[PDB]
Motif scaffolding. Structure first.
Motif, PDB file in Angstrom:
ATOM      1  N   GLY A 257       0.778  -1.220   0.000  1.00  0.00           N
ATOM      2  CA  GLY A 257       0.000   0.000   0.000  1.00  0.00           C
ATOM      3  C   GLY A 257       0.812   1.273   0.000  1.00  0.00           C
ATOM      4  N   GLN A 258       2.110   1.192  -0.264  1.00  0.00           N
ATOM      5  CA  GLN A 258       2.978   2.356  -0.301  1.00  0.00           C
ATOM      6  C   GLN A 258       3.383   2.650  -1.737  1.00  0.00           C
ATOM      7  N   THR A 259       3.298   3.919  -2.117  1.00  0.00           N
ATOM      8  CA  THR A 259       3.703   4.374  -3.438  1.00  0.00           C
ATOM      9  C   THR A 259       5.123   4.917  -3.353  1.00  0.00           C
ATOM     10  N   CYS A 260       6.021   4.346  -4.146  1.00  0.00           N
ATOM     11  CA  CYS A 260       7.440   4.642  -4.055  1.00  0.00           C
ATOM     12  C   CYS A 260       7.986   5.122  -5.394  1.00  0.00           C
ATOM     13  N   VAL A 261       9.075   5.883  -5.315  1.00  0.00           N
ATOM     14  CA  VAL A 261       9.616   6.645  -6.435  1.00  0.00           C
ATOM     15  C   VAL A 261      11.036   6.163  -6.702  1.00  0.00           C
ATOM     16  N   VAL A 262      11.302   5.767  -7.947  1.00  0.00           N
ATOM     17  CA  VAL A 262      12.550   5.117  -8.338  1.00  0.00           C
ATOM     18  C   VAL A 262      13.093   5.778  -9.599  1.00  0.00           C
ATOM     19  N   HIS A 263      14.357   6.205  -9.550  1.00  0.00           N
ATOM     20  CA  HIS A 263      15.097   6.603 -10.750  1.00  0.00           C
ATOM     21  C   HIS A 263      15.746   5.361 -11.351  1.00  0.00           C
ATOM     22  N   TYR A 264      14.941   4.570 -12.052  1.00  0.00           N
ATOM     23  CA  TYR A 264      15.484   3.332 -12.582  1.00  0.00           C
ATOM     24  C   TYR A 264      16.248   3.589 -13.874  1.00  0.00           C
ATOM     25  N   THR A 265      17.091   2.624 -14.230  1.00  0.00           N
ATOM     26  CA  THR A 265      17.880   2.690 -15.453  1.00  0.00           C
ATOM     27  C   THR A 265      18.126   1.271 -15.931  1.00  0.00           C
ATOM     28  N   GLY A 266      17.615   0.945 -17.112  1.00  0.00           N
ATOM     29  CA  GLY A 266      17.768  -0.394 -17.629  1.00  0.00           C
ATOM     30  C   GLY A 266      19.096  -0.611 -18.325  1.00  0.00           C
TER      31      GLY A 266
ATOM     32  N   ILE B 122      12.633  -6.449 -25.967  1.00  0.00           N
ATOM     33  CA  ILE B 122      13.324  -7.473 -25.201  1.00  0.00           C
ATOM     34  C   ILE B 122      13.264  -8.772 -25.993  1.00  0.00           C
ATOM     35  N   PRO B 123      14.393  -9.363 -26.360  1.00  0.00           N
ATOM     36  CA  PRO B 123      14.365 -10.646 -27.052  1.00  0.00           C
ATOM     37  C   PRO B 123      13.989 -11.756 -26.091  1.00  0.00           C
ATOM     38  N   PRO B 124      13.513 -12.891 -26.596  1.00  0.00           N
ATOM     39  CA  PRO B 124      13.234 -14.026 -25.712  1.00  0.00           C
ATOM     40  C   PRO B 124      14.508 -14.585 -25.103  1.00  0.00           C
ATOM     41  N   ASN B 125      14.364 -15.085 -23.869  1.00  0.00           N
ATOM     42  CA  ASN B 125      15.451 -15.601 -23.033  1.00  0.00           C
ATOM     43  C   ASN B 125      16.530 -14.533 -22.828  1.00  0.00           C
ATOM     44  N   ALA B 126      16.132 -13.452 -22.166  1.00  0.00           N
ATOM     45  CA  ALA B 126      17.017 -12.334 -21.891  1.00  0.00           C
ATOM     46  C   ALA B 126      17.225 -12.187 -20.392  1.00  0.00           C
ATOM     47  N   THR B 127      18.418 -11.738 -20.019  1.00  0.00           N
ATOM     48  CA  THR B 127      18.776 -11.513 -18.626  1.00  0.00           C
ATOM     49  C   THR B 127      18.919 -10.016 -18.398  1.00  0.00           C
ATOM     50  N   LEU B 128      18.274  -9.514 -17.352  1.00  0.00           N
ATOM     51  CA  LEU B 128      18.015  -8.092 -17.205  1.00  0.00           C
ATOM     52  C   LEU B 128      18.834  -7.499 -16.067  1.00  0.00           C
ATOM     53  N   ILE B 129      19.411  -6.326 -16.323  1.00  0.00           N
ATOM     54  CA  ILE B 129      20.236  -5.598 -15.367  1.00  0.00           C
ATOM     55  C   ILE B 129      19.625  -4.217 -15.179  1.00  0.00           C
ATOM     56  N   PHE B 130      19.525  -3.769 -13.932  1.00  0.00           N
ATOM     57  CA  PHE B 130      18.920  -2.474 -13.655  1.00  0.00           C
ATOM     58  C   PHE B 130      19.728  -1.706 -12.624  1.00  0.00           C
ATOM     59  N   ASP B 131      19.947  -0.423 -12.892  1.00  0.00           N
ATOM     60  CA  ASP B 131      20.438   0.511 -11.888  1.00  0.00           C
ATOM     61  C   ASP B 131      19.215   1.137 -11.231  1.00  0.00           C
ATOM     62  N   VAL B 132      19.022   0.852  -9.949  1.00  0.00           N
ATOM     63  CA  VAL B 132      17.807   1.216  -9.236  1.00  0.00           C
ATOM     64  C   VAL B 132      18.192   2.033  -8.012  1.00  0.00           C
ATOM     65  N   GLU B 133      17.651   3.243  -7.914  1.00  0.00           N
ATOM     66  CA  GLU B 133      17.815   4.089  -6.742  1.00  0.00           C
ATOM     67  C   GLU B 133      16.444   4.395  -6.161  1.00  0.00           C
ATOM     68  N   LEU B 134      16.298   4.194  -4.856  1.00  0.00           N
ATOM     69  CA  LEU B 134      15.024   4.382  -4.166  1.00  0.00           C
ATOM     70  C   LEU B 134      15.049   5.721  -3.441  1.00  0.00           C
ATOM     71  N   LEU B 135      14.421   6.727  -4.041  1.00  0.00           N
ATOM     72  CA  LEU B 135      14.224   8.034  -3.419  1.00  0.00           C
ATOM     73  C   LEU B 135      12.722   8.273  -3.384  1.00  0.00           C
ATOM     74  N   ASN B 136      12.068   7.750  -2.356  1.00  0.00           N
ATOM     75  CA  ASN B 136      10.625   7.597  -2.364  1.00  0.00           C
ATOM     76  C   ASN B 136       9.944   8.492  -1.333  1.00  0.00           C
ATOM     77  N   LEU B 137       8.633   8.310  -1.211  1.00  0.00           N
ATOM     78  CA  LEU B 137       7.842   8.894  -0.140  1.00  0.00           C
ATOM     79  C   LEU B 137       7.056   7.784   0.542  1.00  0.00           C
ATOM     80  N   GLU B 138       6.123   8.165   1.418  1.00  0.00           N
ATOM     81  CA  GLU B 138       5.212   7.266   2.144  1.00  0.00           C
ATOM     82  C   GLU B 138       5.934   6.193   2.959  1.00  0.00           C
TER      83      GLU B 138
END
Length: 107
Positions: free
Chosen positions: A19-28, A91-107
């Motif tokens: 039930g918390q809404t969070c804010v992410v500067h994601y980067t694929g 996204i091609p099939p059978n792909a492995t995913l990398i993400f730069d994820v920063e959590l600067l959120n509220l709530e």
């Protein structure tokens, strides 16, 4: 299999709950490939909540394993995001995913 490698600083205590809404500067990033997505470009930092299965499964577990100010590094398996299907043209099939994820959120 969500593998976290955290760039340290933050608080380490404010964790995302239901039930918390969070804010992410994601980067694929594609493994052995180029970028495919960046929230930094649009500069709209993707306000989303937790518990509605909006995001993929690999991003969903790794979002809960962070805190305010932290900066993790996802490594998602194919079977949790797209590896059977593949997102069409992006996204091609059978792909492995990398993400730069920063959590600067509220709530």
């Amino acid at each position: 299999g969500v593998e976290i490698e955290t760039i340290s600083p933050g608080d380490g205590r404010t964790f995302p709950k239901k039930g918390q809404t969070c804010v992410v500067h994601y980067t694929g990033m594609l493994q052995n490939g180029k970028k495919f997505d960046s929230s930094r470009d649009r500069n709209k930092p993707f306000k989303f909540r937790i518990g509605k299965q909006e995001v993929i499964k690999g991003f969903e577990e790794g979002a809960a394993q962070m805190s305010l100010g932290q900066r993790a590094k996802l490594t998602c398996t194919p079977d949790v995001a797209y590896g059977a299907t593949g997102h069409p043209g992006v996204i091609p099939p059978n792909a492995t995913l990398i993400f730069d994820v920063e959590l600067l959120n509220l709530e």
